[PDB]
C-alpha cells in the first residue's frame, strides 16, 4: 500500500501515511422504558362513518404500546404518498404523538392535497402545515360507507374573505355580503352561500367515492412516546464498542460510570462541543457517560 | 438515512457534502495563509538568532 | 351559586431580574449558552395587583405571548387557574384547581361566572370542604381530566418569614401548554426580591388550546354558606401578586459545575449587555 500511495513499484525511505483504524461497534444496545400496554385501535380506524371536510375531528389516541400489526390488518389501504419517509418503517421506533384525524372527502380531490396547487382543501377552506411530517392514508369501505338511501349530510364551505392560520379547525359562518346596494344578509340574490353539500348514493363514477381519509399528524425529536410496537430494552454492556440507542438517537461508543451529578429531570448531558456524553436508563437511575469509539 | 431512502436520498444529501467541502476549503486556505505568515515570522526569528 | 361584583382594579411596579426557566433537559456544565425564547424583560416595568389582601376582584387578564406569574405569601392564597379564549363553553378552557389533596386539571369546554369561587369555614364541623361550586356546574361535553400531586405548598404555611415565592410560566407552543414553575426559598421580605433565581420545567400537556383571555382564581374563606354571612362585602383589590409578559428575544446564559444557571443577561438591553 505504500507503493500504491507513491504510485510506483518502489519506495524511497521514511514515514508515509495510510488509513485509520476505525474500530467497529461489536453490537447494539437499545434502552426503552418498562411500560408495555396494548392499545385498542379498533375504536379509531374501522368505526362508523366519519365527518366531511368541513369539520376535522382531531382525535389524539392516548399513550398505548401498539404494534404495526393492528394497523396492518386493513387490506384496502390505498393512499401511498409520503414526504421523505418510506411507508415501510412505521414501527421499531417510538414516535411523539398521533393525531389520527379521520374524515371523508369527495373522491376527486385526493390528488390536490399537496401544496403549491389550490384545490377544494388547499384553498381558504383549510390551511395545512408546510412541513407536513405526518402522512395521509385513505382506504375505502364503500360497502357500508354509502347507504342505499343516500348520505346528504356531508358539507363543505367554499367562499371566504380572510386567510386562516395553518393547523386550525375551520368551523364558522363565513357569509358573503357585498355589492353596490344595502343587503344586510336578507337581500336574496346577493347571498351567494358558500356552504354546499355532497350527497352519497351508490350509483356514481370514479371521483365520487367516499374515503376514510385518516391524516396522521406527528413530529420528531420528543422525549416521551405515544404509540409504538413492543420492543425490549436489552441488557447493557460496559467498556464495549457498541451502538447505543437512547430512545431515538443512536451512536457508537463505550460506557463509563459518571462521577459527576445531574438533576433528576436533567438526564441529557450535552457539552460545549455539542455531543451526547451523559445518559440514564428510562427504567433505572444509571448515572453514566459515553465516550465514542 | 433513518428518514430518507436510497431511491430518494442522494438528491437531498448532496448539498451537505458540498457545504462541508467548501467549509474545509475556506479553513484550509486560512491555514495556508496563516502558516505562510508564521513561516515568515519564524524565518525572521531564525535570522535574529 | 354565583356572588359577584362588577368592580375590577390594577396596580403598577417595576421588576428587575425574574423569569428564568430551563428550556430543555440538557446538562450544560460550567459553560455559556444563547437563549432565544419567550422571556421577561430585564428591569421590566411590570404590572402589579394591589397589595391590599380580604378583597375580591373579577379581573380580565390578557394572555400575550406567554405569561409569567409571581406570588409570595403563606397559606396558599391563590388556588385556581383558568386559561383560554372566552371561557364560556365555546372555546377550549384549561382549568387548574389546587386543593390540599391532589391538584386537578380540566382541559374542557366550560362556561363560567365572571368570578367563580367557593366559600370555606369550619362552622362547628372542622371541614373546609368544597360546599360551593360556583364554577361551571354544567356543559361537561369535554375530553380531558388529570390528577397530579400538589406541587404547591398547602394551606397554613407556618414558616419563619416570607419564606417561599411561587414563580410560574404558562407557555404555549403549537397548542402544547407547559407550566414551568418554581417554589423558590426567598428570604428578603420586601415586595420583589432583588436576587437571582431559576425555574424548573415540570408540566407539559400537548393537548391543543387557543388562549387569548386567561385568568387566575383562588379559593379562600368568605362564609362557607350563602345566608350565614353578608355577601358583596369584599372590595375590588384581589391580592398582592405580580404578572409579567414574555417576548422572544436574545439572552445569554451561564452554567456552573453542578449544571445549574448562576447568571444570565438580557442580550436585547443597554449596549454593554
Coordinates of C-alpha atoms in Angstrom, one line a residue:
Chain A
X1 CA 0.0 0.0 0.0
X2 CA 3.0 2.4 0.4
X3 CA 4.0 1.5 -3.2
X4 CA 0.3 2.1 -4.1
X5 CA 0.3 5.6 -2.4
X6 CA 3.6 6.5 -4.0
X7 CA 2.2 5.5 -7.5
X8 CA 5.4 3.5 -8.2
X9 CA 6.7 0.0 -7.7
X10 CA 9.4 1.2 -5.3
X11 CA 9.6 3.4 -2.2
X12 CA 12.4 5.6 -1.2
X13 CA 12.6 6.0 2.7
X14 CA 10.9 7.0 5.8
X15 CA 7.4 7.7 7.1
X16 CA 4.3 7.5 5.0
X17 CA 0.5 7.8 5.6
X18 CA -2.4 5.4 5.2
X19 CA -5.9 4.9 6.5
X20 CA -7.0 4.9 10.1
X21 CA -8.1 2.0 12.4
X22 CA -11.8 2.9 12.8
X23 CA -12.8 0.3 15.5
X24 CA -16.2 -1.2 14.7
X25 CA -19.2 -1.4 17.1
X26 CA -19.4 -5.0 18.3
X27 CA -23.2 -5.0 19.0
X28 CA -26.1 -2.6 19.5
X29 CA -27.9 -2.0 22.8
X30 CA -31.3 -0.3 23.0
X31 CA -32.8 1.4 26.1
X32 CA -36.6 1.7 26.4
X33 CA -39.0 2.2 29.3
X34 CA -40.5 -0.8 31.0
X35 CA -44.2 0.1 30.1
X36 CA -46.0 -2.1 27.6
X37 CA -49.8 -1.7 27.5
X38 CA -51.8 -2.9 24.4
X39 CA -53.9 -0.4 22.6
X40 CA -57.4 -0.8 21.0
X41 CA -57.0 0.8 17.5
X42 CA -60.4 -0.8 16.5
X43 CA -62.1 2.3 18.1
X44 CA -60.2 4.7 15.8
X45 CA -59.9 3.2 12.3
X46 CA -62.9 0.9 11.5
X47 CA -65.5 2.8 13.4
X48 CA -68.7 4.3 11.9
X49 CA -68.9 6.8 9.1
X50 CA -66.8 9.9 9.8
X51 CA -67.3 13.6 9.2
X52 CA -66.9 15.6 6.0
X53 CA -64.1 18.0 5.1
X54 CA -65.9 21.0 6.8
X55 CA -65.1 19.5 10.2
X56 CA -61.8 18.0 11.4
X57 CA -62.4 15.6 14.4
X58 CA -58.7 15.9 15.6
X59 CA -58.6 12.9 17.9
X60 CA -55.4 12.1 19.7
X61 CA -55.1 8.5 20.7
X62 CA -53.6 8.2 24.3
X63 CA -50.3 6.7 25.2
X64 CA -50.5 3.0 24.4
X65 CA -48.0 0.4 23.1
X66 CA -49.4 -0.8 19.8
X67 CA -47.6 -2.9 17.2
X68 CA -47.9 -2.2 13.4
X69 CA -49.9 -5.5 13.0
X70 CA -53.2 -4.0 14.2
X71 CA -52.9 -1.1 11.7
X72 CA -51.7 -3.5 9.0
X73 CA -54.8 -5.7 9.3
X74 CA -56.6 -3.3 7.0
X75 CA -56.5 -4.7 3.4
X76 CA -58.0 -1.8 1.4
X77 CA -55.2 0.7 2.2
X78 CA -54.9 2.8 -1.0
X79 CA -53.0 6.1 -0.2
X80 CA -49.3 5.7 -0.6
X81 CA -47.9 9.2 -1.0
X82 CA -45.4 10.4 1.7
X83 CA -42.7 13.1 2.2
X84 CA -39.2 11.9 2.6
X85 CA -40.1 8.7 4.5
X86 CA -40.8 5.3 3.1
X87 CA -44.1 3.9 4.3
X88 CA -42.5 0.7 5.4
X89 CA -40.8 2.0 8.6
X90 CA -43.9 2.8 10.7
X91 CA -42.7 0.7 13.6
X92 CA -39.4 -0.2 15.5
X93 CA -39.1 3.5 16.5
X94 CA -41.3 5.3 19.0
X95 CA -43.0 8.4 17.6
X96 CA -44.1 11.5 19.5
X97 CA -47.9 11.7 19.5
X98 CA -50.5 10.5 17.0
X99 CA -53.1 12.9 15.5
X100 CA -55.3 10.4 13.5
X101 CA -57.8 12.9 12.0
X102 CA -60.3 10.6 10.3
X103 CA -62.9 12.1 8.0
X104 CA -64.4 11.9 4.5
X105 CA -63.7 13.9 1.4
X106 CA -65.1 13.9 -2.2
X107 CA -63.1 11.5 -4.3
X108 CA -61.8 13.9 -7.0
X109 CA -59.7 16.0 -4.6
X110 CA -57.3 13.2 -3.4
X111 CA -54.7 14.3 -5.9
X112 CA -55.0 18.0 -4.9
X113 CA -53.9 17.8 -1.2
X114 CA -50.2 18.8 -2.0
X115 CA -49.2 22.4 -1.5
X116 CA -48.3 24.6 -4.5
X117 CA -51.8 23.9 -6.0
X118 CA -55.0 25.3 -4.7
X119 CA -58.0 22.9 -4.7
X120 CA -61.0 22.3 -2.5
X121 CA -58.8 21.8 0.5
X122 CA -55.7 23.9 -0.2
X123 CA -58.0 27.0 -0.7
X124 CA -59.3 29.1 2.2
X125 CA -61.3 26.1 3.4
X126 CA -58.1 24.6 5.0
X127 CA -54.5 25.6 5.7
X128 CA -52.1 22.7 6.1
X129 CA -48.6 22.9 7.8
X130 CA -45.8 23.5 5.3
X131 CA -43.5 20.7 6.7
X132 CA -46.2 18.0 7.0
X133 CA -44.3 15.4 8.8
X134 CA -47.4 13.3 9.1
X135 CA -48.8 11.3 6.3
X136 CA -52.1 10.5 4.6
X137 CA -53.8 7.1 4.5
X138 CA -57.2 6.7 2.7
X139 CA -58.9 3.3 2.5
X140 CA -62.3 2.7 1.1
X141 CA -65.2 0.9 2.9
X142 CA -67.9 1.8 0.4
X143 CA -69.8 -1.5 1.2
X144 CA -71.1 0.4 4.3
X145 CA -69.8 4.0 3.7
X146 CA -72.7 4.9 1.4
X147 CA -76.2 3.8 2.4
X148 CA -78.6 2.7 -0.4
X149 CA -81.0 5.5 0.7
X150 CA -78.3 8.3 0.5
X151 CA -76.0 10.3 2.6
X152 CA -76.6 14.0 2.1
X153 CA -75.1 15.2 5.5
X154 CA -71.6 15.9 4.1
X155 CA -70.9 19.6 3.6
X156 CA -68.1 21.9 2.7
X157 CA -67.5 25.7 2.7
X158 CA -66.3 27.3 -0.5
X159 CA -66.0 31.1 -0.2
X160 CA -64.1 33.0 2.4
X161 CA -62.6 36.5 2.7
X162 CA -59.7 36.4 5.1
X163 CA -56.8 33.9 5.5
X164 CA -56.6 31.1 8.1
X165 CA -53.6 30.2 10.2
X166 CA -52.4 26.6 9.5
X167 CA -53.4 23.7 11.8
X168 CA -56.8 25.2 12.8
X169 CA -60.3 23.8 12.7
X170 CA -62.3 25.9 10.2
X171 CA -65.9 25.8 11.5
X172 CA -67.7 29.1 11.4
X173 CA -70.4 31.0 9.4
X174 CA -68.2 32.9 6.9
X175 CA -71.0 34.6 4.9
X176 CA -70.8 36.8 1.8
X177 CA -72.1 40.4 1.9
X178 CA -71.1 42.8 -0.8
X179 CA -72.5 44.7 -3.8
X180 CA -73.4 48.3 -4.6
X181 CA -76.6 48.1 -2.6
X182 CA -77.7 47.5 1.1
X183 CA -78.0 43.8 1.7
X184 CA -77.8 43.1 5.4
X185 CA -78.0 39.3 4.9
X186 CA -81.5 39.1 3.6
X187 CA -81.1 40.6 0.1
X188 CA -81.8 37.5 -1.8
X189 CA -79.7 37.1 -5.0
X190 CA -76.8 38.9 -3.2
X191 CA -76.4 36.0 -0.8
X192 CA -74.0 33.5 -2.7
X193 CA -74.0 31.0 0.1
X194 CA -70.5 29.3 0.5
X195 CA -71.7 26.1 2.1
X196 CA -72.6 23.2 -0.2
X197 CA -73.5 19.5 0.2
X198 CA -72.1 16.3 -1.3
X199 CA -74.7 13.6 -1.4
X200 CA -73.7 9.9 -1.5
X201 CA -75.8 7.2 -3.2
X202 CA -74.1 4.1 -4.7
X203 CA -74.6 5.0 -8.4
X204 CA -71.6 7.2 -9.1
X205 CA -68.4 7.5 -11.2
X206 CA -64.8 7.5 -10.2
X207 CA -64.3 10.8 -8.4
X208 CA -67.4 10.5 -6.3
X209 CA -66.3 7.7 -3.9
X210 CA -66.1 8.3 -0.2
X211 CA -62.9 7.5 1.6
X212 CA -62.0 7.1 5.3
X213 CA -59.1 9.6 5.0
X214 CA -57.0 9.5 8.1
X215 CA -54.3 12.1 8.1
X216 CA -51.6 11.3 10.7
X217 CA -50.0 14.3 12.2
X218 CA -46.9 14.0 14.4
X219 CA -43.4 15.4 14.8
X220 CA -39.9 14.3 15.7
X221 CA -37.3 14.7 18.5
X222 CA -39.6 14.5 21.5
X223 CA -38.5 12.5 24.6
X224 CA -41.7 10.6 25.6
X225 CA -43.8 8.5 23.2
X226 CA -47.5 7.7 22.5
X227 CA -47.8 4.7 20.2
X228 CA -45.1 2.2 19.2
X229 CA -44.6 -1.6 18.9
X230 CA -43.4 -3.7 21.8
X231 CA -39.6 -3.7 21.8
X232 CA -37.5 -4.6 24.7
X233 CA -34.7 -2.7 26.5
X234 CA -31.9 -5.2 26.0
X235 CA -29.2 -5.8 28.6
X236 CA -26.4 -3.2 28.8
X237 CA -22.6 -3.6 28.2
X238 CA -19.7 -1.8 29.8
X239 CA -16.5 -0.7 28.0
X240 CA -17.8 -2.3 24.8
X241 CA -17.7 -0.6 21.5
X242 CA -21.5 -0.5 20.9
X243 CA -24.3 1.2 19.0
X244 CA -26.3 2.7 21.9
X245 CA -29.9 3.7 21.4
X246 CA -31.3 6.2 23.9
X247 CA -34.9 6.2 22.8
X248 CA -34.4 7.6 19.4
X249 CA -30.8 8.9 18.9
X250 CA -28.1 6.3 18.5
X251 CA -24.4 6.3 18.3
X252 CA -21.2 4.3 18.6
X253 CA -19.1 4.4 21.8
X254 CA -18.2 2.8 25.1
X255 CA -19.7 3.3 28.5
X256 CA -18.1 4.8 31.6
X257 CA -19.5 5.5 35.1
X258 CA -20.3 9.2 35.6
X259 CA -18.7 10.6 38.6
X260 CA -20.5 13.9 38.2
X261 CA -24.0 14.5 39.4
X262 CA -27.1 15.7 37.4
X263 CA -30.5 16.9 38.2
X264 CA -33.2 14.2 38.1
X265 CA -35.0 15.9 35.2
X266 CA -31.8 16.9 33.5
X267 CA -30.8 13.4 32.4
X268 CA -29.5 14.7 29.0
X269 CA -25.9 15.8 29.2
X270 CA -24.7 17.7 26.1
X271 CA -21.5 19.6 26.3
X272 CA -19.8 22.7 24.9
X273 CA -18.7 20.5 22.0
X274 CA -22.4 19.7 21.5
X275 CA -22.1 15.9 21.8
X276 CA -24.2 13.5 23.9
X277 CA -21.9 12.1 26.6
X278 CA -24.3 11.6 29.6
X279 CA -27.4 9.4 29.8
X280 CA -29.6 7.4 32.2
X281 CA -31.8 4.4 31.6
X282 CA -35.5 5.1 31.0
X283 CA -36.3 2.5 33.7
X284 CA -33.5 2.8 36.2
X285 CA -31.3 5.6 37.6
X286 CA -28.0 5.0 35.7
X287 CA -25.7 8.0 36.1
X288 CA -23.4 7.2 33.2
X289 CA -21.3 8.8 30.4
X290 CA -20.4 7.8 26.9
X291 CA -17.0 8.2 25.2
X292 CA -17.1 7.4 21.5
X293 CA -15.2 4.5 20.0
Chain B
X1 CA -30.7 7.8 6.3
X2 CA -33.2 6.8 9.0
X3 CA -35.7 9.1 7.3
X4 CA -34.8 9.1 3.6
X5 CA -34.4 6.2 1.2
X6 CA -31.8 5.2 -1.5
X7 CA -34.3 5.9 -4.3
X8 CA -34.7 9.4 -2.9
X9 CA -31.7 10.1 -0.5
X10 CA -28.9 11.4 -2.7
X11 CA -30.8 14.3 -4.3
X12 CA -31.3 15.8 -0.8
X13 CA -28.0 14.7 0.8
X14 CA -25.7 16.1 -1.8
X15 CA -25.5 19.7 -0.7
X16 CA -24.3 18.7 2.7
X17 CA -21.2 17.2 1.1
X18 CA -20.6 20.3 -1.0
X19 CA -21.1 22.6 2.1
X20 CA -18.7 20.6 4.2
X21 CA -16.2 20.6 1.3
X22 CA -16.3 24.3 0.8
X23 CA -16.1 25.0 4.5
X24 CA -12.9 22.8 4.7
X25 CA -11.7 24.7 1.6
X26 CA -12.1 28.0 3.4
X27 CA -10.5 26.6 6.6
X28 CA -7.5 25.2 4.6
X29 CA -7.0 28.4 2.7
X30 CA -6.9 30.3 6.0
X31 CA -4.5 27.6 7.3
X32 CA -2.1 28.1 4.4
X33 CA -2.1 31.9 4.6
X34 CA -1.6 31.8 8.4
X35 CA 1.1 29.1 8.0
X36 CA 2.8 31.3 5.4
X37 CA 3.0 34.4 7.6
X38 CA 4.1 32.3 10.6
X39 CA 6.8 30.8 8.3
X40 CA 7.9 34.3 7.5
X41 CA 7.9 35.2 11.2
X42 CA 9.9 32.1 12.0
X43 CA 12.4 33.0 9.3
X44 CA 12.8 36.4 10.9
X45 CA 13.3 34.7 14.3
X46 CA 16.0 32.4 12.7
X47 CA 17.6 35.5 11.2
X48 CA 17.6 37.2 14.6
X49 CA 19.1 34.3 16.5
Chain C
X1 CA -74.4 29.8 43.1
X2 CA -72.8 33.0 42.0
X3 CA -72.0 36.1 44.1
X4 CA -70.3 38.8 42.1
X5 CA -69.2 42.4 41.9
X6 CA -68.7 44.4 38.7
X7 CA -65.6 46.1 40.0
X8 CA -62.0 45.5 38.8
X9 CA -58.7 47.1 39.6
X10 CA -55.0 47.1 38.7
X11 CA -51.6 48.2 40.2
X12 CA -48.1 49.0 39.0
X13 CA -44.5 48.3 39.9
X14 CA -41.1 47.6 38.3
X15 CA -39.4 44.1 38.2
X16 CA -35.7 43.7 37.9
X17 CA -34.5 40.1 37.2
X18 CA -37.0 37.3 37.1
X19 CA -38.4 34.6 34.9
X20 CA -35.5 32.1 34.1
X21 CA -36.9 28.7 33.1
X22 CA -34.8 25.8 31.9
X23 CA -35.7 25.3 28.2
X24 CA -34.5 21.6 27.9
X25 CA -33.2 18.7 29.9
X26 CA -29.5 19.4 28.9
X27 CA -26.8 19.2 31.5
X28 CA -24.5 22.0 30.3
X29 CA -21.7 22.2 32.9
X30 CA -19.7 25.4 33.6
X31 CA -20.3 26.8 30.1
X32 CA -22.3 29.5 28.4
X33 CA -25.2 29.4 26.0
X34 CA -27.5 31.6 23.9
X35 CA -31.3 31.5 24.6
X36 CA -33.9 32.8 22.1
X37 CA -37.3 32.1 23.7
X38 CA -40.2 33.9 25.5
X39 CA -38.8 35.6 28.5
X40 CA -39.5 38.5 30.8
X41 CA -37.5 41.8 30.1
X42 CA -34.8 42.8 32.5
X43 CA -35.7 45.8 34.6
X44 CA -39.2 45.3 33.2
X45 CA -41.9 47.8 34.2
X46 CA -44.3 45.1 35.0
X47 CA -48.0 45.1 36.0
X48 CA -48.9 44.5 39.7
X49 CA -52.0 43.6 41.5
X50 CA -53.0 45.6 44.6
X51 CA -51.1 45.0 47.8
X52 CA -54.3 45.0 49.8
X53 CA -55.1 41.4 50.9
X54 CA -59.8 40.3 52.3
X55 CA -60.5 41.7 48.8
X56 CA -62.3 40.3 45.7
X57 CA -62.0 41.2 42.0
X58 CA -63.3 39.9 38.8
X59 CA -60.5 40.9 36.5
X60 CA -59.6 40.3 32.9
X61 CA -56.1 39.0 32.3
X62 CA -54.7 39.3 28.8
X63 CA -52.6 36.4 27.6
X64 CA -49.8 38.0 25.4
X65 CA -47.2 35.5 24.1
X66 CA -46.6 33.6 27.3
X67 CA -47.4 34.7 30.8
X68 CA -45.2 34.9 33.9
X69 CA -46.7 35.0 37.3
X70 CA -45.3 35.5 40.8
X71 CA -46.8 35.4 44.3
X72 CA -45.1 35.3 47.7
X73 CA -47.4 34.5 50.6
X74 CA -48.3 31.9 53.2
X75 CA -51.3 29.5 53.5
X76 CA -51.8 29.2 49.7
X77 CA -53.7 32.4 48.9
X78 CA -54.2 31.6 45.2
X79 CA -55.8 28.4 44.1
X80 CA -57.4 28.4 40.6
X81 CA -56.1 29.0 37.1
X82 CA -58.4 29.4 34.0
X83 CA -56.8 29.9 30.6
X84 CA -58.4 30.1 27.2
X85 CA -60.1 32.5 24.7
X86 CA -63.6 33.2 26.0
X87 CA -64.2 30.7 28.8
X88 CA -67.9 30.5 28.1
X89 CA -68.5 26.9 26.8
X90 CA -67.4 27.9 23.2
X91 CA -63.6 27.8 23.3
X92 CA -61.2 25.4 24.9
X93 CA -60.7 26.2 28.6
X94 CA -57.8 24.9 30.8
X95 CA -58.7 24.6 34.4
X96 CA -56.3 24.2 37.3
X97 CA -57.6 23.6 40.8
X98 CA -55.1 23.2 43.7
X99 CA -56.6 21.7 46.9
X100 CA -54.6 20.1 49.7
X101 CA -55.3 16.6 48.4
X102 CA -54.3 16.4 44.7
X103 CA -54.3 19.1 42.0
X104 CA -56.8 18.6 39.3
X105 CA -56.6 19.6 35.6
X106 CA -59.6 20.0 33.2
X107 CA -58.9 21.0 29.6
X108 CA -62.6 21.2 28.9
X109 CA -65.4 23.4 27.4
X110 CA -66.9 25.1 30.4
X111 CA -68.9 28.2 30.8
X112 CA -68.1 30.4 33.8
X113 CA -69.2 33.1 36.1
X114 CA -67.2 36.3 35.8
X115 CA -65.7 35.4 39.2
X116 CA -66.3 31.8 40.2
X117 CA -65.4 30.9 43.8
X118 CA -66.1 28.6 46.8
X119 CA -66.6 29.7 50.4
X120 CA -65.0 27.7 53.2
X121 CA -65.1 27.9 57.0
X122 CA -65.4 25.2 59.6
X123 CA -68.7 26.1 61.3
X124 CA -68.6 23.5 64.1
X125 CA -67.5 20.8 61.6
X126 CA -63.7 21.2 61.2
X127 CA -64.2 20.8 57.4
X128 CA -63.3 23.5 54.8
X129 CA -64.7 21.1 52.2
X130 CA -66.0 22.3 48.8
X131 CA -69.5 23.3 49.6
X132 CA -69.9 25.9 46.9
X133 CA -69.4 25.0 43.2
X134 CA -69.8 28.5 41.6
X135 CA -67.7 27.2 38.7
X136 CA -69.4 25.8 35.5
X137 CA -71.7 23.2 37.1
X138 CA -72.7 22.1 33.5
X139 CA -71.5 21.6 29.9
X140 CA -69.4 18.5 30.6
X141 CA -69.1 17.6 26.9
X142 CA -65.3 17.5 27.0
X143 CA -62.4 15.2 26.7
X144 CA -59.8 15.8 29.4
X145 CA -59.2 15.1 33.1
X146 CA -55.9 14.8 35.0
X147 CA -54.9 14.4 38.7
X148 CA -51.4 15.2 40.0
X149 CA -49.6 15.6 43.3
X150 CA -49.8 19.1 44.7
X151 CA -46.5 20.9 43.9
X152 CA -47.9 23.9 45.7
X153 CA -47.2 24.2 49.4
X154 CA -50.5 23.7 51.1
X155 CA -52.7 25.8 53.4
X156 CA -51.4 27.2 56.7
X157 CA -47.8 27.8 55.7
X158 CA -46.1 28.3 59.1
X159 CA -42.6 29.3 58.2
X160 CA -40.0 31.8 59.5
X161 CA -40.8 34.8 57.2
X162 CA -41.9 35.3 53.6
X163 CA -40.0 32.1 53.1
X164 CA -41.1 31.0 49.6
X165 CA -42.1 32.8 46.4
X166 CA -44.0 31.0 43.6
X167 CA -42.9 31.8 40.1
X168 CA -45.0 30.4 37.2
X169 CA -44.5 30.3 33.4
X170 CA -47.6 29.5 31.3
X171 CA -46.3 28.9 27.8
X172 CA -47.9 27.6 24.6
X173 CA -46.0 26.0 21.7
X174 CA -48.2 24.6 18.8
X175 CA -51.1 24.0 21.1
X176 CA -48.8 22.5 23.8
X177 CA -49.4 24.1 27.1
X178 CA -46.5 23.9 29.5
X179 CA -46.2 25.1 33.1
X180 CA -42.6 25.9 34.2
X181 CA -42.8 26.8 37.9
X182 CA -40.5 27.3 40.9
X183 CA -41.3 27.3 44.7
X184 CA -38.1 29.2 45.4
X185 CA -36.9 29.9 49.0
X186 CA -36.8 33.7 49.2
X187 CA -35.8 35.4 52.4
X188 CA -35.8 39.2 51.6
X189 CA -39.3 40.1 52.7
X190 CA -39.7 43.3 50.6
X191 CA -42.0 43.1 47.6
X192 CA -40.0 42.0 44.6
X193 CA -36.8 40.3 45.9
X194 CA -33.6 41.7 44.5
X195 CA -31.8 38.5 43.5
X196 CA -31.3 35.7 41.0
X197 CA -33.4 32.6 40.6
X198 CA -34.2 29.7 38.1
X199 CA -37.4 27.8 37.2
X200 CA -37.6 24.1 36.7
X201 CA -39.8 22.6 34.0
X202 CA -42.5 20.3 35.4
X203 CA -45.8 20.3 33.4
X204 CA -46.2 19.6 29.7
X205 CA -49.6 18.9 28.2
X206 CA -49.7 18.5 24.4
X207 CA -53.5 18.8 24.1
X208 CA -54.5 21.7 21.9
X209 CA -56.0 25.0 23.1
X210 CA -56.1 28.6 22.0
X211 CA -55.5 31.1 24.8
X212 CA -56.3 34.8 24.5
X213 CA -58.1 35.9 27.6
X214 CA -56.9 33.9 30.7
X215 CA -57.5 34.3 34.4
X216 CA -56.1 33.3 37.8
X217 CA -58.5 32.2 40.6
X218 CA -58.5 31.3 44.2
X219 CA -60.4 29.5 47.0
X220 CA -60.5 31.2 50.4
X221 CA -62.6 31.9 53.4
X222 CA -65.7 34.1 52.9
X223 CA -68.7 32.5 54.5
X224 CA -69.0 28.6 54.0
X225 CA -72.7 29.2 53.4
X226 CA -74.8 31.8 51.4
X227 CA -77.0 33.1 54.2
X228 CA -74.8 32.9 57.3
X229 CA -72.7 36.0 56.3
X230 CA -73.5 39.1 54.2
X231 CA -72.4 39.0 50.6
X232 CA -70.9 41.7 48.4
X233 CA -68.7 42.9 51.3
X234 CA -65.3 42.3 49.8
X235 CA -63.7 45.2 48.0
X236 CA -62.1 45.0 44.5
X237 CA -58.5 44.7 45.4
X238 CA -57.6 41.0 44.9
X239 CA -54.3 40.0 46.5
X240 CA -50.6 41.1 46.1
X241 CA -49.2 39.2 43.1
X242 CA -47.2 40.2 40.1
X243 CA -47.9 39.5 36.4
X244 CA -45.5 39.8 33.5
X245 CA -45.4 39.3 29.8
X246 CA -42.8 37.4 27.8
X247 CA -41.3 38.0 24.4
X248 CA -39.0 36.1 22.0
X249 CA -35.7 38.0 22.2
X250 CA -32.0 37.1 22.6
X251 CA -30.4 36.4 26.0
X252 CA -27.2 34.9 27.3
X253 CA -26.9 32.2 30.0
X254 CA -24.1 30.8 32.1
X255 CA -23.8 27.4 33.7
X256 CA -21.9 26.1 36.7
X257 CA -20.1 22.9 37.7
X258 CA -23.4 21.4 39.0
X259 CA -25.1 22.3 35.7
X260 CA -27.5 24.9 37.1
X261 CA -27.8 28.5 36.0
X262 CA -25.9 31.0 38.1
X263 CA -26.1 34.1 35.9
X264 CA -27.9 35.3 32.8
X265 CA -28.1 38.6 30.9
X266 CA -30.6 40.2 28.5
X267 CA -28.9 40.4 25.1
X268 CA -31.5 42.9 24.0
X269 CA -30.8 45.7 26.5
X270 CA -28.4 48.6 27.0
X271 CA -25.4 48.1 24.6
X272 CA -22.9 46.9 27.3
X273 CA -25.2 43.8 27.5

